[PDB]
Amino acid sequence: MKILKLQTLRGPNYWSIHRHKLVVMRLDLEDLYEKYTSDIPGFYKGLTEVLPSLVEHLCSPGVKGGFLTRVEKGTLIGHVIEHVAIELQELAGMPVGFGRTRETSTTGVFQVVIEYENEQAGRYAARAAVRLCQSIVDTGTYPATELQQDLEDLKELKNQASLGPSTEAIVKEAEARGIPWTQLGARFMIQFGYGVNQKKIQATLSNQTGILGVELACDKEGTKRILKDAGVPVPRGTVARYFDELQDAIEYVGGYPIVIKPLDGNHGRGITIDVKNWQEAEEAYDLARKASKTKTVIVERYYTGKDHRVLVVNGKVVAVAERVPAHVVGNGKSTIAELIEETNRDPQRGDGHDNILTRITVDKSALDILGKQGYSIDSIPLKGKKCFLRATANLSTGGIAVDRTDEIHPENVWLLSRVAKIIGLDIAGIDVVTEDISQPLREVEGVIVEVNAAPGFRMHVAPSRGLARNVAGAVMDMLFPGSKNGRIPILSVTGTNGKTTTTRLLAHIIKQTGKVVGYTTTDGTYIGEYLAETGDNTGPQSAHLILSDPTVEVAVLETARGGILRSGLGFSSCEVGIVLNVTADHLGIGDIDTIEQLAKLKSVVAESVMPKGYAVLNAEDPLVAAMADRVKGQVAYFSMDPNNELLLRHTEAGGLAAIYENGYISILKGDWTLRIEKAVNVPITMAGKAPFMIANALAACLAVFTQGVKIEHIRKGLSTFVAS
Amino acid sequence: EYENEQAGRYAARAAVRLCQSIVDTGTYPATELQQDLEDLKELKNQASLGPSTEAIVKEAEARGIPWTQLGARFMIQFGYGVNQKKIQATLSNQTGILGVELACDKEGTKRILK
Amino acid sequence: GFRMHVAPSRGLARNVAGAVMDMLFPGSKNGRIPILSVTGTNGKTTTTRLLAHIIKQTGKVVGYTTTDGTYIGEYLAETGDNTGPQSAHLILSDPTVEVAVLETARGGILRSGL
Amino acid sequence: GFSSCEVGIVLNVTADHLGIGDIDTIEQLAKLKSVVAESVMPKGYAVLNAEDPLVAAMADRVKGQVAYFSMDPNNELLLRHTEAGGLAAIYENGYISILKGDWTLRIEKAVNVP
Amino acid sequence: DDDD
Amino acid sequence: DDDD
Ligand SMILES: Nc1ncnc2c1ncn2[C@@H]1O[C@H](COP(=O)(O)OP(=O)(O)OP(O)(O)=S)[C@@H](O)[C@H]1O
Ligand SMILES: Nc1ncnc2c1ncn2[C@@H]1O[C@H](COP(=O)(O)OP(=O)(O)OP(O)(O)=S)[C@@H](O)[C@H]1O
Ligand SMILES: Nc1ncnc2c1ncn2[C@@H]1O[C@H](COP(=O)(O)OP(=O)(O)OP(O)(O)=S)[C@@H](O)[C@H]1O
Ligand SMILES: *N[C@@H](CCCNC(N)=[NH2+])C(=O)O
Ligand SMILES: *N[C@@H](CCCNC(N)=[NH2+])C(=O)O
Ligand SMILES: *N[C@@H](CCCNC(N)=[NH2+])C(=O)O
Ligand SMILES: *N[C@@H](CCCNC(N)=[NH2+])C(=O)O
Ligand SMILES: [Mg+2]
Ligand SMILES: [Mg+2]
Ligand SMILES: [Mg+2]
Ligand SMILES: [Mg+2]
After folding, report:
1. What is the Cα–Cα distance from D87 to D104, expressed in whole angstroms?
2. Does B91 touch chain C (CB under 8 A)?
3. Are A307 and A235 in contact (CB under 8 A)?
4. Are the beta carbons of A614 and A631 closer than 8 angstroms?
5. Residue with the nearest Cα to atom 10 of ligand 7?
6. Residue of A nearest to D95 (CA)
7. Which of A307, A568, C65, D29 is 20 to 30 A from residue A437's alpha carbon, by CA?
8. Which of A215, A201, A282 is nearest to A249 (CA)?
């Protein structure tokens, strides 16, 4: 047991396509190379007692317990290590269902490929599987304490590398719409789309959310002043820094009752709702000042009515939720003492940051509130009527949300949209206190309490007493208005011998159109006319630089075999995928020992072409031409021999080929021939003396033609491109 | 005519007191005159924008673009209705929260730029 | 702060405020919306409401202030007299108003001007 | 009168006026009315009554997406269609609702529809 | 702060 | 902070 190499693949790869996240391990089996499980005494029993859940694994037999039957028959341990890694990272709550094992050319090393949901979790599971299997083959069993330690480490790794619920909702919507998404490395920011079409979100703030609006929302008094200047019904009140100002502030609001609350507070930190006398007023001021970080508090008039949260996205009301505080109803002739834990036994109850409906937490503050309620633990509710536990009405404590989106008055919708626009927030959460959201806020004495930037919408996607609202869908609609993804044209060039020249020629041709081209070659990564980065810059680590640049409109990526083998492709799909040739020259590196394996590896580019894209293949190369099948999207052939039977048959039914017919670089669009240049006026061809350069020019011209680039631009770019 | 509202009101209130003191006693104390001038200078300083806001507002006035002072956070609003913009000192209403927060983070900015 | 660019002290000053205002208002465009001020002795409210209705026939959001109250589009934004500049600011600062129609009584002009 | 339609709606097929032309069986009538459903372009939609077995049988041999409408909200075929995909319409609780998969969008109370 |  |  020695781990030679541990690679992680993040995109389409040699092992699979549509299985982007994989881990590949080179495992040495020095002393246990060619002995089966049946040859190992007690291995099956120890394995099946350490991990009984392996009984679920449907192997190639395809029946329940098929993997266990295979273990009974006796096979190599690579398969069982794959299976135990899969089950080990699946027991931690990460469902994975892909695995492979292969014997390498070298005498002892195997290759094990395991699907993962989390990169660190997948690597840790791969590392733990070999230790578990070695311990079973050495001692016949694995300690349960070590199994629990590994499982809890996997769970901790999963939790650590996890987004917050708003971010999964938005990312899942983007995935459903086919919008590419990547994780930036600065502040848990997510980038959607590519190049000039990209957007950024953190949790709910987008890259278009204004600093001024966010900072105004966080200022309670400033928000109240601005809304009052706009005619919005805000509560009447004033600030009071010291104790001596309490009276003078109380007579300002217009009598009793009043509300006392800190201005540097959130989530109800030390806020008192209802007070009707001076003793309550002074206790309230003291408590709020203790909760205040700057010893400053606000008094205001108390407004009766239910508390509603209104979500406004892109100036439109998306969801309205009424927040009912923790309460119990004794319609079953039962008192609070039973219902407090009767509700706690509901499977809907859940702590943490995933389950929104938090269990009813009975604290000493809650005991004080229920003492103020006027009833006791064993006081049966009258007539089976709602009796409350607190007044903050927050889901973080055990309250509930009721969907009211379909009941809001149109005038209220207009007013709340206007409020969101006045504050200056693209996504806003407005807190309203009103007796009836179905009536305008002027008839009833409804008020706008506060406006929150970056609101959480987990209460709107699971109201628990109404219809869920597609908030993430509205956010994605705001970010990408039409049926538009954030993609830019991507041209991925692969092949054994002409990648760099073709990539540079493609970039030069596209530069003729007024577009900024970001292209990576072996020489370095360029954006437009300037060098963005030096070095090799051929793997996905340089593709991310191009795809994340806010000025790049078209990406041209040289995709060598090394990057695909090491970490797969840097993108899920490409608009154009060019395969120039496949020749067995540098053979034996990695697990690539046959030219068929090299063709399979280079076919990843061709197979990753989107259904609306094009695969530009060399019809003259049999291995490259064989990639015509298993390709989604159209196929365009290029050939230095104009009499290629496959190319001619392809052009007869359809078209889109490129040939070198009579000293001419020509595009065949079916029955039509469009000549670009005489191939002696193209400098790189060296007056037509370099057939390789002519083939590269053919591929580049066909690739740009498939994307609608006009013939004159292709001609100018081909004539002005100098070999360098 | 005034340049600052509070300063103009204070000058109007002080002028009648100065004239009444002159008619009653024949002169005005120099200490009271200096106190009034210091109060006027303090009023001018208090109700003053910053040089960045001053320059931007002067350019907007030179271009004939209306400008008003919002009462919340020293924000200046240019234009009217749907055609309005807002600035504080150099931040505009189109300046992003994410960009500002990333710029304030030294290590995050270095990582992103690298 | 561009305070060092508008007065380098060892080179040419740069018009930073001009660049900021170009960013805020790209073309030769001010931030103005069409303003229609109705004044007179006896027909201000009726004319203001009729103008608001006529412009509403065009697909435009009309913010108009009359004696009855201040309206934006079809909805009442504020009650009261609302015929002075203190109510004109509400219309002119609203982010959704495209055309402003203001009833300008002599009382507001006398009190605080236009 | 057209080669293709963006939306093809089939409401119901009832064997009432049989015998006209060569149409003598309700299967022939369903085949005749299925011309509209089969003329929907691949990017188009076929709106079918899931509550009608003959109309629901037109789900196959249709190019383009299929959207079901049912007066019974518990139609098993409609629910199965919404679970994998969406785009259905039901009358659930005094409500004309659109099912977009797992999302319910209510339009009107069906008593406010004249 | 965050998810207000 | 402010006018950096
Ligand atoms: N003037 C008021 N009149 C009536 N109810 C009020 C008033 N002020 C606050 N409330 C209620 O008290 C709740 C909390 O008030 P907030 O000022 O929002 O306190 P907080 O510190 O902001 O806590 P969060 O983050 O808003 S839940 C509101 O959601 C209302 O239900
Ligand atoms: N289509 C072609 N077929 C065969 N040989 C070619 C072809 N195009 C170029 N060559 C030869 O291969 C050499 C290197 O090609 P380049 O395109 O510059 O490098 P490359 O294809 O990027 O290879 P790497 O893996 O990136 S170093 C050229 O100098 C030619 O001699
Ligand atoms: N052009 C006019 N000439 C004379 N009287 C008019 C005219 N237009 C309207 N009136 C009458 O004047 C009355 C009051 O004028 P209104 O247009 O209703 O309001 P108003 O002109 O704004 O008065 P104020 O300034 O608000 S008190 C109307 O009810 C009409 O009877
Ligand atoms: N809800 C949250 C938003 C404050 C601004 N957020 C960031 N990231 N600057 C809050 O703190 O109230
Ligand atoms: N409210 C926010 C918090 C989770 C994301 N925060 C961090 N630090 N990852 C959310 O997205 O729910
Ligand atoms: N330069 C200044 C910018 C901080 C963001 N400004 C405001 N008003 N939030 C800084 O503090 O570095
Ligand atoms: N840096 C900034 C300071 C003026 C704005 N601040 C206040 N309190 N008015 C500036 O405008 O230069
Ligand atoms: Mg808050
Ligand atoms: Mg709140
Ligand atoms: Mg190269
Ligand atoms: Mg009037």
Report:
1. 10
2. no
3. no
4. no
5. B50
6. A406
7. C65
8. A282
Q: Which residues of chain C lie closer than 8 angstroms to A414, CB-CB?
A: 73, 75
Q: List, as one string, the DSSP characters of B38-77.
A: HHHHHHHHHT---HHHHHHHHHHHHTT--EEE-SSSS-EE
A441 near A415, Cβ under 8 Å? yes
Shortest CA gap C78–chain F (Å): 36
**Which residue in the block uniquely carries the two structure tokens 């196929």?**
A635
Nearest to D48 by CA among D83, D89, D15, D14: D89
Burial bucket for residue A127 (CB in 10 Å: 0-12, 13-18, 19+): middle
Of A189, A212, A215, the CB nearest to B98: A189
In 10 A of CB A537, how many CB atoms? 23
* Resolution of the experimental model, in Å, one decimal: 2.5
Q: Render A157-170 in DSSP notation, one character per residue.
A: HHHHT---HHHHHH
**E2 to chain A nearest CA, in Å?**
6
CA distances in angstroms from B56 to B60, B74, C18, listed in the order given:
6, 14, 8
Tell me which DSSP letter residue A24 carries.
Answer: E
Query: Domain A490-720 has what CATH class?
Result: alpha beta
Alpha-carbon distance of C8 to B41, in angstroms, equals: 28
- Whether A555 and A194 have beta carbons less than 8 Å apart is answered as yes
Strand partners, D97: D90, D106
C-alpha A173 – ligand 3 centre gap (Å)? 58
- Name the maximum alpha-carbon separation found in chain C: 64
Provide the b/e sequence for A61-84 (b: ≥16 CB within 10 Å).
Answer: eeeebebbebbeeebbbbbbbbbb
Nearest CA to ligand 4 atom 12: E1
* CB-side neighbour CA atoms (13 Å) of A422: 27
Q: Experimentally, how was this structure solved?
A: cryo-EM
| Rounded distance between C-alpha atoms, residue B1 and residue B8, angstroms | 7
- Separation CA A457–CA A479 (nearest Å): 17
The count of other CB atoms within 10 Å of the CB of residue C34 is 13
Q: How far apart are CA A593 and CA B39, in angstroms?
A: 90
User: How far apart (Å, rounded) are the C-alpha atoms in residues D101 and D68?
Assistant: 12
**CA distances to A85, A594, A600, A604, A626 from A587, in Å:** 31, 7, 13, 18, 20
Residue owning the nearest CA to atom 5 of ligand 7: B50
Listed in sequence order, the residues at least 6 apart from A104 whose beta carbon sits closer than 8 Å to its beta carbon are: A26, A110, A111, A591
